[PDB]
Design a protein around this ligand. Structure first.
Ligand SMILES: CN(Cc1cnc2nc(N)nc(N)c2n1)c1ccc(C(=O)N[C@@H](CCC(=O)O)C(=O)O)cc1
Ligand SMILES: Nc1ncnc2c1ncn2[C@@H]1O[C@H](COP(=O)(O)OP(=O)(O)OP(=O)(O)O)[C@@H](O)[C@H]1O
Ligand SMILES: Nc1ncnc2c1ncn2[C@@H]1O[C@H](COP(=O)(O)OP(=O)(O)OP(=O)(O)O)[C@@H](O)[C@H]1O
Ligand SMILES: [Mg+2]
Ligand SMILES: [Mg+2]
Lengths: 167, 353, 352, 111, 56, 56
């Protein structure tokens, strides 16, 4: 499970309210690393996108019941992780309720470190400054059309254990 | 450019360290080499010069770390001190070698030019000499594994240096920094290397009348053995042969002697006697240390086998009782310490006034 | 004004009884630290250093006790640690930097106060390497912890985890200097007495010229521990670099029968007082005769556990009493005598 | 092998049981087990307890509570479950545990 | 063996243990809950097979 | 030794082993993929130095 996200300064990415920037560069990289993947979206994120995403096995983690069939709807975190199963990569893109609930079960974190200064009530949890080590580096410094930065990064965590072998 | 000369800096290093002439000279020439290189960046004129990476090998309390601190005072280029025991391979939860450059940037004020002209002192380099018996199951996050990353960095490779990060993210500029012109000073007390070096130079003893049998007093000190060190010895200790090859100059310190210890107590700018004298005077009492007592302290320190650090044990003990009741008693002007006090058979006299 | 060592010793005698040397070492150390803080401008060429103490005492002597008492009177941030939990860098186990993290929490984010603090790393004797011989395997919990602490004692700038102490919204690692923080170690070092004997006692062998004592004239553990030198600690499994960072070495003495009697009534929170509170909150008075305390002291010496041994003796003597007395009625006070400690007699309960 | 070593742990046994029980603790808590070669973890006449027999006595000392009942610490994950810190809890007070061995030499002891 | 004994010496007497904040109500992201253990009754138990001979 | 020959005794006669599912660019299966070892031809060879004498 990789919690692809941006974590805009003040965690202003925006799910309840339609994405402020709505730039092609952020949607292109997204589509590129999401095609056919079981992206576990949510009700707030479905509100801002709506549009059925070609190929992507959309899973709307909603607190309310499921209505649409084209895009699957799940109610519990157990049902949300059951639909996707054990596939090599799950791009959880749902609401804050979804983001934080799946954080304990995240291995990688495809971040975007956007700079857009907005406000609201939708925020992401904190990220371990040391456990999550950035392995990939790609600079996407703010362009004319791209108002704020969209620097794509990849993170992961690792730890060592001793074995204390004898004879 | 190159305004300071080796002799000039040597007079500044002698104000804090007493002895280790070879170490001082090695550090002096290499420091001047970097300055000469600075004239045209990396001595680009025709033939390109190699690096001057130093390998400081000295016993505990010899002055290894002390040299780095005193040198920074007179230096102008950015200097950052790092400990090899806190570095872990990339990916793990521990620190990464990349952060070493980040520390340097703070001293450099984020100036790429000044940054690549700094000096990196890596203390405790003898602690990552992998000792594992080829398990191969897990990795040595504090052993060989780190060397593989540090080795590629010293030979000259582009480094990932995320900007400072005042805002939430530094935009991962990861400005490449060349380490071919940077000077590295790896130090640490290789406790046990003396035994390794002994075997290579071991004359060999027997049991009969014609053997070479020597008593413990007649043996050789680690300082003398260290002087005969060779690169092969470092490999047995658990270091990659390529790593030691990158460091051509190896500086072997000499175990401090009684005379050296007596000087350290009074001559240095911030000697122990001056340290206690300062706080004793901060309270309003004058302290006098007779030369006779000074030699006594050194004799005891030579038995602790902790170098100059042993001195503080002897002094704190001698003055423990004195320092406990002194703040309460009044009508006291000066105190004189005699050799007998160090032995423990007498109590420091007080000049009541 | 600053407090004098004598004042500190009084605070340390309210809780501890029978350790004069350790009270002085810690008192002068605190005195030095207090003046070393006021004189922060360092208006002199000298660079005042610091001396680290290493309390070595037998089990049940008051090593951890003194550390706790210090926090009561001092004002600067104080912290406690456990070396058994510390592990080398890069493993799931705790890191040495966590210590500063816990110190920051007690410092209220006042970096200046945290830069001048006192730490008490307990169980420092369990991290000792197997032996002076080289280690075949990476002793994550052994040398790794020692070698990792070396820089903290001599001075370095540890990187403390951010978003901690009294600041939740922070991303930039806070820097703190460990050049003005007095780290007071402490351990029990069980088994050192044998190492010390191999140096302080020589000639032991079979023959007419050898030496034999029979354990009757042999020195006690306390005596042997007062002659400890760094050469001995190396055998115990302490790297020479670690001992050098701990110049001061304070040695405790095994409590005596006389001292144990004083510990039962003189201390502020003496064992006896703790039990009396229980009997008193339920509605009964409790007192112990002077002869009773003497018997307890002799039995505790046999257990070889220091003051901890006392609790076993007391609990056993009144075990049955504390089980049936809560149901008894018309009872106002209890009195335990020396006979009850040996079992020949039973406690005489004063009805009323 | 005993806990904290490079070998296997006694909790792995309960991990294999979940693969066959579709990771359903309830069903896994009412299953049968068969530990083969239970005769190779027997002390080699080391009654004095000279060293730690992590392959012998050490393994026996870890099962004393599994056969009786205890809140075992299942390995982090060996199924669909993505996280590791979860450390699924399971009770073994209603889980039969069969143990078979050959005990080569016991025939002499009996005689 | 001895390693587990050396770790409980401070627990049975009192320390500040750090528990991974996962599950339940564990709001702290990395501010590991400090649980004083100076008031927790510990009741160990063992069979001590062979101790009888030592006493004899 | 004898212990090494005891473990292989089972593998050659069927074992549901647990192999880390990695090395094939993040294998979709992440459940310690099993492999039946009751259909793999185990051609165990070796040069028994001395058997010739034993047989004679
Ligand atoms: C609200 N939002 C979430 C969103 C936006 N940018 C991201 N950018 C990155 N890097 N990662 C994400 N998690 C991410 N998520 C959106 C908004 C629009 C589309 C969208 O219309 N996608 C197009 C892709 C762009 C296009 O080709 O039109 C598609 O066809 O699926 C999806 C996600
Ligand atoms: N020649 C000297 N003159 C004055 N002081 C000294 C000298 N050598 C050591 N010291 C004292 O010792 C301390 C520095 O210790 P030192 O740098 O020798 O440790 P180290 O040998 O680097 O440690 P390690 O062996 O772990 O690497 C300083 O406080 C300094 O006062
Ligand atoms: N001198 C003393 N006066 C009063 N009580 C004491 C004394 N020494 C020990 N105690 C009692 O023993 C307990 C403290 O044990 P102590 O601190 O001696 O263990 P320790 O040896 O420090 O443990 P560790 O080996 O982990 O350091 C307290 O409950 C205290 O009541
Ligand atoms: Mg040093
Ligand atoms: Mg204690």
């Amino acid at each position: 499970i990789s919690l692809i996200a941006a974590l805009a300064v003040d965690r202003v990415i925006g799910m309840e309210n339609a994405m402020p920037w709505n730039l092609p560069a952020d949607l292109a990289w997204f589509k590129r690393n999401t095609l056919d993947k079981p992206v576990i979206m949510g009700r707030h994120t479905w509100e801002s996108i709506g549009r059925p995403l070609p190929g992507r096995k959309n899973i709307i983690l909603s607190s309310q019941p499921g209505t649409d069939d084209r895009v699957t709807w799940v109610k519990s975190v157990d049902e949300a992780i059951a639909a996707c199963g054990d596939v090599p990569e799950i791009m959880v893109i749902g609401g804050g309720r979804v983001y934080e609930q799946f954080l304990p079960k995240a291995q990688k974190l495809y971040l975007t470190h956007i700079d857009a200064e907005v406000e609201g009530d939708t925020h992401f949890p904190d990220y371990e400054p040391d456990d999550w080590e950035s392995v990939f580096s790609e600079f996407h410094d703010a362009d004319a059309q791209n108002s704020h930065s969209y620097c794509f990064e990849i993170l992961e965590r690792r730890g060592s254990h001793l074995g204390l072998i004898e004879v | 450019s190159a305004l300071p000369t080796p002799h000039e800096i040597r007079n500044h290093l002698d104000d804090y360290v007493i002895g280790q002439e070879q170490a001082k000279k090695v550090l002096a020439v290499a420091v001047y080499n970097h300055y000469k290189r600075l004239r045209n960046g990396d001595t680009s004129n025709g033939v390109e010069l190699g690096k001057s990476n130093i390998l400081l090998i000295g016993p505990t309390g010899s002055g290894k770390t002390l040299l780095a601190e005193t040198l920074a005072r007179l230096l102008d280029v950015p200097f950052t001190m790092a400990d090899a025991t806190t570095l872990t391979e990339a990916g793990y939860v521990g620190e990464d070698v990349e952060n070493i450059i980040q520390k340097l940037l703070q001293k450099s004020d984020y100036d790429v030019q000044k940054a690549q002209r700094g000096i990196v002192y890596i203390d405790e380099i003898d602690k990552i000499s992998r000792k594992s018996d080829n398990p191969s199951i897990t990795r040595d996050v504090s052993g060989e594994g780190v060397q593989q990353a540090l080795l590629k960095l010293i030979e000259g490779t582009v480094a990932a240096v995320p900007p400072q990060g005042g805002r939430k993210h530094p935009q991962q500029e990861f400005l490449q920094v060349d380490t071919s012109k940077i000077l590295f000073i790896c130090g640490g007390a290789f406790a046990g290397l003396d035994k390794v070096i002994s075997h290579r130079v071991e004359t060999g003893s027997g049991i009969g009348f014609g053997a070479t049998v020597k008593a413990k007093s007649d043996k050789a000190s680690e300082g003398e053995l260290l002087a005969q060190v060779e690169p092969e010895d470092l490999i047995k200790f658990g270091l990659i042969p390529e790593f030691i090859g990158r460091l051509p100059v190896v500086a072997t310190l000499n175990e401090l002697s009684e005379e050296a210890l007596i000087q350290i107590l009074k001559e240095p700018k911030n000697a122990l006697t001056k340290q206690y004298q300062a706080l004793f005077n901060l309270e309003g009492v004058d302290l006098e240390f007779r030369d006779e007592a000074l030699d006594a302290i050194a004799k005891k320190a030579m038995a602790r086998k902790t170098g100059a650090r042993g001195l503080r044990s002897i002094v704190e003990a001698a003055l423990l009782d004195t320092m406990y009741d002194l703040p309460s008693m009044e009508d006291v002007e000066k105190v004189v310490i005699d050799e007998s006090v160090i032995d423990g058979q007498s109590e420091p006299l007080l000049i009541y006034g």
